[model samples]
Every structure is written in structure tokens, then in C-alpha cells.
Target: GAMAQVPTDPGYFSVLLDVKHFSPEEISVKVVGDHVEVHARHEERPDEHGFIAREFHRRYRLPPGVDPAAVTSALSPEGVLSIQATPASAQASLPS
Candidate 1:
């Protein structure tokens, strides 16, 4: 299972996805309009044996002032996926 934490401060918004059993290449993140979407898929096949597959989809709606263009994502070695979104006006105030 995976968990997500979404919190906002006075000037920015953040989403942290606690994920496991998946590699960076098996996950995808996208910004669609006012929502952020996360997709994860994994598969395993053993020689002359059965196969295992898993997938999940999650979406989070942005608040009123979020800037879709400023969205970013980073996947850590410990399987935590971090996404941060900044307000349109605050984008200029944050370091890249």
C-alpha cells in the first residue's frame, strides 16, 4: 500500500507519496489542469512460472492559486515521491 501527505503553507503547497516495492521507472507523474495525477505499475515474471503485476492511480486536486506550470517531482532512494506546487504569484519568490 501507498500513502500520501498533502499540506500547504502560507506560500506553497506540497504532496509527499510514501511508496514501496516500486522503482522510479515504474511511476509517472503528470499535471492536468487543476489536478496532479500519479500512476504506478510493476510486473514480474519468473522463468516458466507465473507472473505478478500491480498498478495504482491517484489524483489530487489543487487549490485555487496553484500554478500548474510550477509543479515538480522527485523520487527518493527510499521510495518516497515528493511533489511540490507553488502559487502563481509565489513562483517568483521560490528558488528553482
Candidate 2:
């Protein structure tokens, strides 16, 4: 719903997602460092709940030096998910 920038260190980063109104015929997902994408089109529901309204979520463990705040997500009414993320800055600091 919004975007923001923040400082982060080199480590694994991930995000949780909730999906609704996805087609049950076809489903797909893509992973790129701190980003993840999903695609689907058919008729379906959550694995646990079959009320037509379901939640789809995936957590990505980002690569080293990846930033979380820079991550982005895109979803379609037909059930397509896309996420984008960038790497963090180098590890450098002045004397304490």
C-alpha cells in the first residue's frame, strides 16, 4: 500500500503475503534475492480454508547484503504476485 526507505545491514530479508481470489488451475512463484513473484489463474481458495476467500503468503530469506525497505510488491486481480528488491550498501563505518 505504501513505500519507504530505511538503513539495513547485510543479512537475510523476507516478507509475508496474503492472497485472495486466485485461480486453482495454475499457480506459479518466482524468487529473486529479496523479491518474490507469483502467478495464477483458475479458481481456488486457501489450502486450509475453502471459502473462495483465501490467503496466500510466502516468506523470502533474502541474500546477504540485501535491503528490505527497498522491496516492492505487485499483485493482480487474476492472482499474480510480483516483488522487487535491491541490495544494501557496502559494509563500511568509521571508528567508534
Candidate 3:
């Protein structure tokens, strides 16, 4: 299966995705408002069997207190993308 795997901890979160043949910097990863997000969109030219499309418009919500330095991206081969984050302090939980 090409399904992504996510392994996280109380200190940080990680994301694993399948994006074969994606360029190193083509996919931008950074920390946004409420989470560390990664934007990945790749183009595939028309194939003999007729295949052309854009995939990857996704977001992962996490604790705002968890800040990521850009994005930690790594691929075992080329069929997957692994993302991990670093934890930060300051914003505690909200309460009534």
C-alpha cells in the first residue's frame, strides 16, 4: 500500500507521505498558524496510458506550541517523504 504512516510523540510530530520522484526543494515545509505544514504538489507529464495530474494539497494540525524549523524531510528511496518537527514551549493549554 502507498498509505502514509505517522509516528509522533508528546514533544513532536511526524508525517510520512508517498511522493515519488519529487524534487528536493519543490516541496516547501514550514510552520504555520496552528501547526507545522508541508505543501507538496508535483506534476506528471502525459503517459502512454494517459496519466496527468497534480497531487498533494495537504495539512496536518498540531499544537501551536510545537514549532518546526522549516521542515525535516527525508526519503528512504524516492517513493516516500518523511516529516518531523521540533517542540517548543510557552503556549499552554486553554481552559474555562
Candidate 4:
């Protein structure tokens, strides 16, 4: 089991996940209401010995007024998955 690292600012929130050894196609991200869910699956390769499959599931609770539609994600060369969510304009108009 693993947990993602999350950091937040006044207008946006970000999630950092360590997904080493996983390809972009093996990961899935979704926003459900005030929550963000990440699913990853790695199929066993036929290289060396042993047979095993790896999977990861993680969910994060978003702050109120977060704009789900504005969420974005990117994977780095080092296999780190980064996701960011911005606040709705209406909410961003308010205080921090």
C-alpha cells in the first residue's frame, strides 16, 4: 500500500504519486464529486522468472469549491504522476 503526496495553495491543489515501473497506459485517474481516485495496474511481463501483477489504488478528498473539470495530470520521465486541481472561479473570488 502507498499514499500520494498532496500539497495545496489558495487557488489550486496538487497530488504527487510515485509510480515507478508503470507506464502511462497502465494508470487511470478520475474525479468523483469531492474526491479524486487513481487506479494503476501493471501486467506481468514474460522476461525473466516469476509471475506477478502489480496494482495501486489511491483516493484523495478534494477541498470544497474545487473545479473538477479543471483538473489535469501529467507523468514525468522518472515515473512520477502529478495531478493538479484548481478552484472554481466563483469560489476563487472569495478569500483564501
Number of the predicted model whose TM-score against the real structure is largest: 1
- Candidate 2, run of 10 with poorest lDDT: 11-20
True-vs-predicted CA distance for residue 90, candidate 3, Å: 6.0
What's model 4's lDDT at 73?
92
- Candidate 3 is scored at a TM of 0.56
What tens digits encode model 1's per-residue C-alpha lDDT throughout 1-96? 689887546535688997777888999999998899999999998866888999988999877787888889999999999999887874366677
lDDT of 4 by residue, 56-93 (tens): 99998887777888888999999999999888876376
Give the C-alpha lDDT of model 1: 0.85
How accurate locally is residue 59 in candidate 1, as Cα lDDT from 0 to 100? Answer: 98
What TM-score does candidate 2 get on C-alpha atoms?
Answer: 0.39
Count of backbone clashes for each model?
Answer: 0, 5, 0, 0
Ranked by lDDT, top first: 4, 1, 3, 2
TM-score against native, each model: 0.77, 0.39, 0.56, 0.75
Question: For model 4, what is the C-alpha lDDT against the true structure?
Answer: 0.87
Those runs of model 2 whose alpha carbons end farther than 4 Å from true positions after fitting are 1-52, 91-96
lDDT (10s digit) by residue, model 3, range 1-96: 798888645657677877775666557666677666667666666767775656566788864445655447676666687887667756568873
Error of 1 at 92 (Å): 14
Q: Pick the candidate with the highest lDDT.
A: 4
lDDT of every predicted structure (CA atoms): 0.85, 0.56, 0.67, 0.87
Candidate 1: list runs displaced more than 4 Å: 1-11, 90-96
